[PDB]
Ligand binder design. Structure first.
Ligand SMILES: CC(C)C[C@H](NC(=O)[C@@H](O)[C@H](N)Cc1ccccc1)C(=O)O
Ligand SMILES: CC(C)C[C@H](NC(=O)[C@@H](O)[C@H](N)Cc1ccccc1)C(=O)O
Ligand SMILES: CC(C)C[C@H](NC(=O)[C@@H](O)[C@H](N)Cc1ccccc1)C(=O)O
Ligand SMILES: [Mn+2]
Ligand SMILES: [Mn+2]
Ligand SMILES: [Mn+2]
Ligand SMILES: [Mn+2]
Ligand SMILES: [Mn+2]
Ligand SMILES: [Mn+2]
Lengths: 499, 499, 499
């Protein structure tokens, strides 16, 4: 998705700014903040006169669109309700921004100017509000129509101006710049997740990574095929892949924005391009949504895309463990025992617990980078949706400082996670009479035991695990599709590590 | 269960103490701590001579039983392995204690003396180790054989002596005293949970509370019947009860150990004496375990029993909301709408979400006590077992300080909980087109939305919610039955509030 | 729901009419019909000037709201898109009307004037368009908030004026009058369906019928209790009811608008106020929607309400067979054999096929009225949703002319049905080795065999059967609730019979 929206920050007077649409906030009770009052005064009270008619109650997201008003250079004035509180929460601020965007998308105006600086958002200053506002606007422009014969009508809206006080403009510009890069990374993530699995297979993802290296000269890419995986001894990764006609790929992304002495941060992504379950076959209902089972790997693409645009001074490694999980006459069977890269043997009791089998070999591979943090991202357990639903990612890890850094990043990004414990008592659920580890722990604590399985391959470094099974996509309705989460959390984490 | 084990703390020399069995720890490699070395020296090296034969590797919990040794007044010497580490974890310490207890139960000795003061446990001093050791021993003596025609053979073991240094003896005695009271409360809790539902119905629990008031003059009890519930307007509590022939009971326990000016702590317990699911009937498999669905209420009994024995200087209120959930020609139907005590209307979409319907009316009732904390305890969601398994209780609440106090208490007691978030975004899952609240939130985030439902009745005070669906009992095997959790967490919380 | 919207038909010029909001249609390409052109000319081209800006593409249902325009007496002008075709279909016309209504509901205007006479709708003249438009508007005003503590904000909109040419005004007024009565009947139907089953039980429906007789002196009501049903020998009706604490009711409505020599039309409605399935218990998931299992009976209420308002010259009888289907220690069992009123014995193989057991006794009862048509209406089979979905009712009968009359009525009302065959070959699926009829026919042709069962009680008159299991309510989402169908079909059928 080409994006291309221009976001500008300006400190000019709203009431003399030439624009197709000037956007103003209105509180409940027809109450007017400083910017809206100044525009109203410029029109001679035309805005307060309309509001007195009572059509706009001022609840968050309600709108009233006015045409040409006296003495303004704005062709239209859009009023958006901001509720009755002095301070909006994050959800309300996003809802207001989305309501503005939805109106602007349907207009023929080529630009709009947002005079929303008077809004207050709990716990967020100028930079933090700009981060949320611009990310919501930019990501709200995302369109996936690759396989529609009838394409979307192109938007007339090509430019958005954020009006800010001179004292705040530098922070608003910084927030906008960071949010745009995050949303650009989100768009790549969403594209890859949304692509169907007959197109987006492991080989395709390897070519996508080579494409990203053509676009960004600071990125180096290596794509390893099944011969190299066998050379490296990644027996559990290969066990997942062997049932499919599609070969697996381990994609290595490397970006060196800091000095050679700075240890890298490693992102490990689950790239299961389609998960049938294998011989442990899934039910048919909703199985199409397993095209999103590579969204962990896609979020590594997207985080790299944001970091490469921002040119952050950090050293970053991405490992995308990509395979397709299929039934066949040569597929892995329940009860197979394999030897992982690490040398630990694994009894594969259920071939639908396959993401942890490609991830564990990638976690062993990650040791060579002498990393200062390793984060894996995976659409890993249905149990995580039972535990935390569709709006909060599960988070687990072996280092409290890293876990806290990721939680803090998710809070700032409003792309939240929540820690679940890896108490040693859970580990015995993975005991196998036949191997070093079983790949399932039974019906109890499923998100945790999956994290426990992964932890056995991450003991040599500081590691965390994001289970995005609930947050990586929307299952149904008009908005079915990949979300791009957790690119905002991950990019925020890296922004903080880059300071 | 009458208990009756005598726990004594003494500071005498182990090698001259008259006892049926002297218990000593042995490390891996036949290594001997200070107490064991002193006993060995007293026997002229008889213990190190035996250990040299190699039968006891010294792994945690392994045992070797010796008879009469030279120059000792101990009739027997029990060696128990303590592993290879300088410091045991909590799990290892419990395992060692249980191994000792299992051996002693099978001997004809009338007492045993534990010379285990040399063991180190990570993060635990004398008092904290005594708390864990004595609770494990005392609770390990629990027996439920009420309906067995062949009763357990009575134990010969009637006395346990803990040997401690003079400088540690006061802390060991304090820990022992507190642990015994906790285990006594646990025994009452376990008895009530284990009793079958044709015996332990709401009326029976009301009589149990009157029995507890006869035993403890500091306790006052009121038992409210269905006429009083209707007078109070508890429409959702009554909706759960109406399908059953057994009438409901709201049991009120009050203990005033502090001055009248000290606001009380309120414990609210789910007392569903059997949960068939109602019209939303449960499957038959394992449904017998729903006799444990009153374990939340039973843990309020048990916590009171511990507090009453210890005479803690706190003001404590217990509210046990007791009903039986049955199908019948007059039972509540899916789609019924009722008015709670609070005035909020609830659409009962699923009659198997019944615990929250008796709890919410009890939470409204709790307002009259002007409490400084309100904790409800409930075997509330199967989703909590998916999220946190059988060993960690789910914890939710509306006050961060209270939540942290409960987590800290569970850590100290080794009866741990884990917080799940009540983010406002989850609340919309309870939206009903027909009432103020629906009683279910769907397949996503089931433990959280149950907590969200309860939170709507707890806004007037500091409140937390413990979902013990996984921790309140053991489902199968030789040890099937109620655990008594979370009496240790709750009593520890109150001990800390009483300082 | 009190309704109360005033619908007026006027033939005045739109451009001089005083109104809070004047509504005009705009075609794709900014094309203007006669009324819209006349208003535009009155403003000096202000409307075409705005449209030239391009914000309103003119797709069906899109809107653009203007404030005060030059030389108009309308405070606001609402433009609504009408698409690119010369003629709208029924669905498009409804969508346009709903879009207008949704906008008007959010404005503070006390009235609105619709200048939509220039719209063409395929196959519909002035009267038929008014029927669809006014029914959509009036039914779109329905609100059910009985058990919400926070009530809906009252609408400012209290009056809608339909502008029509003088030559069309009589037909528009007639269509409006009929549509308002249909929507008023729909509102009663929807209220009863939406009421929860602990409130809306058979006794309650009997009192509702007495209430309707207080409002309409032309209506006579008799309510028969279980003693009378037993006297009449309705063994299958009583078999359904016996498991519940709620007694059954047979409600008889009689309206004599024609001469005594005119044979009556009889409407028979399934009034199962809640369907648990009985001993053949339903699964828990979605079972709350069985509060809509009395929507057949509710549609008889609603059709009577429309006929009574219109004072149609017909003789009409309503039979509401009302019971609650519950499990209990006295409930009917699978394998029970009962004797129906007709004397035919029925083997009740499945207690969840209960609607046909109350209907068949009511169909025998209907014989006494010497009817010229008998129509039963029932939320009868899940198979009907498999066959015809949620938008088309299933229709079956023993008389081709009656079936065709009902199909024609559903087409005119845009509340369509579709015939399924009652070929004699299907009848053998109801053979029982033990009784005259089994109450189920197995997994094949479930909607048809239910109709076949009913047909065995309707041989003495011209009879049809509407299976509204899919059309009587909306299952989920924001708009969950009763629809009021098939009141429009039934009232249209009676309007045609009254000519
Ligand atoms: C076999 C089980 C122990 C593990 C299993 N996990 C998987 O199948 C993963 O590979 C799935 N990719 C997890 C998943 C399933 C449905 C929706 C979102 C995410 C699961 O059922 O969660
Ligand atoms: C209907 C659902 C929203 C809620 C439902 N909860 C219940 O049935 C509770 O009343 C049960 N007492 C919860 C439970 C079930 C099995 C094992 C332990 C605990 C559940 O399935 O968890
Ligand atoms: C037992 C079967 C032969 C008949 C059975 N019918 C019923 O249960 C009716 O009483 C139901 N009221 C039919 C129904 C079910 C679900 C949604 C809408 C309507 C059915 O399953 O359709
Ligand atoms: Mn899988
Ligand atoms: Mn998977
Ligand atoms: Mn239940
Ligand atoms: Mn329960
Ligand atoms: Mn049924
Ligand atoms: Mn039914």
């Amino acid at each position: 998705f080409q994006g291309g929206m221009e976001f500008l920050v300006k400190s000019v007077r709203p009431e003399t700014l030439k624009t197709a649409t000037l956007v103003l906030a209105v509180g409940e009770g027809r109450k007017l903040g400083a910017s809206a009052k100044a525009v109203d005064d410029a029109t001679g009270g035309a805005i307060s006169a309309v509001l007195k008619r009572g059509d706009l109650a001022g609840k968050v997201g309600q709108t009233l669109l006015l045409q040409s008003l006296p003495n303004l250079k704005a062709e239209r004035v859009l009023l958006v309700g901001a509720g009755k509180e002095r301070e909006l929460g994050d959800r309300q601020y996003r809802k207001l921004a989305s309501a503005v965007l939805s109106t602007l998308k349907g207009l023929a105006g080529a630009d709009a100017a947002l005079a929303l600086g008077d809004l207050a958002v709990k716990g967020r200053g100028a930079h933090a509000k700009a981060r949320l506002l611009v990310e919501t606007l930019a990501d709200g422009l995302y369109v996936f129509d690759r396989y529609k014969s009838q394409k979307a009508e192109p938007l007339k809206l090509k430019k958005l101006t954020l009006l800010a006080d001179k004292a705040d403009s530098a922070a608003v510009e910084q927030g906008s710049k960071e949010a745009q890069a995050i949303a650009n990374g989100m768009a790549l993530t969403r594209d890859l997740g949304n692509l169907p699995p007959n197109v987006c297979h492991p080989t395709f993802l390897g070519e996508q990574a080579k494409g990203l290296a053509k676009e960004f000269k600071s990125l180096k890419v290596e794509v390893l095929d099944e011969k190299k995986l066998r050379e490296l001894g990644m027996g559990s990764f290969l066990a997942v892949a062997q049932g499919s006609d599609q070969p697996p790929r381990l994609i290595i992304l490397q970006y060196n924005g800091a000095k050679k002495d700075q240890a890298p941060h490693v992102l490990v992504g689950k790239g299961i391009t389609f998960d049938t379950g294998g011989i442990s076959l899934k039910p048919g209902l909703g199985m199409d949504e397993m095209k999103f089972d590579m969204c962990g790997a896609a979020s590594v693409f997207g985080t790299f895309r944001a970091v490469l645009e921002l040119q952050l001074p950090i050293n970053l490694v991405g490992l995308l463990a990509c395979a397709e999980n299929m039934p066949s006459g040569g597929a892995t069977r329940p009860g197979d025992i394999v030897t992982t890269m690490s040398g630990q043997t694994v009894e594969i009791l259920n071939t639908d617990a396959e993401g942890r089998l490609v991830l564990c070999d990638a976690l062993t591979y990650a040791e060579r980078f002498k990393p200062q943090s390793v984060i894996d991202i995976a659409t890993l357990t249905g149990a995580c949706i039972v535990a935390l639903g569709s709006n909060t990612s599960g988070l687990m890890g072996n280092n409290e400082a890293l876990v806290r850094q990721l939680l803090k990043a998710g809070e700032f990004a409003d792309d939240r996670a929540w820690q679940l414990p890896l108490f040693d008592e859970y580990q015995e659920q993975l005991d196998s009479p036949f191997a070093d580890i079983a790949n399932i722990g039974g019906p109890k604590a499923g998100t945790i035991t999956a994290g426990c399985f992964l932890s056995r391959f991450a003991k040599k470094y500081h590691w965390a695990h994001l289970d995005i099974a609930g947050t990586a996509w929307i299952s149904g309705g008009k908005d079915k599709g990949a979300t791009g989460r957790p690119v905002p959390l991950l990019t925020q984490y890296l922004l903080e590590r880059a300071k």
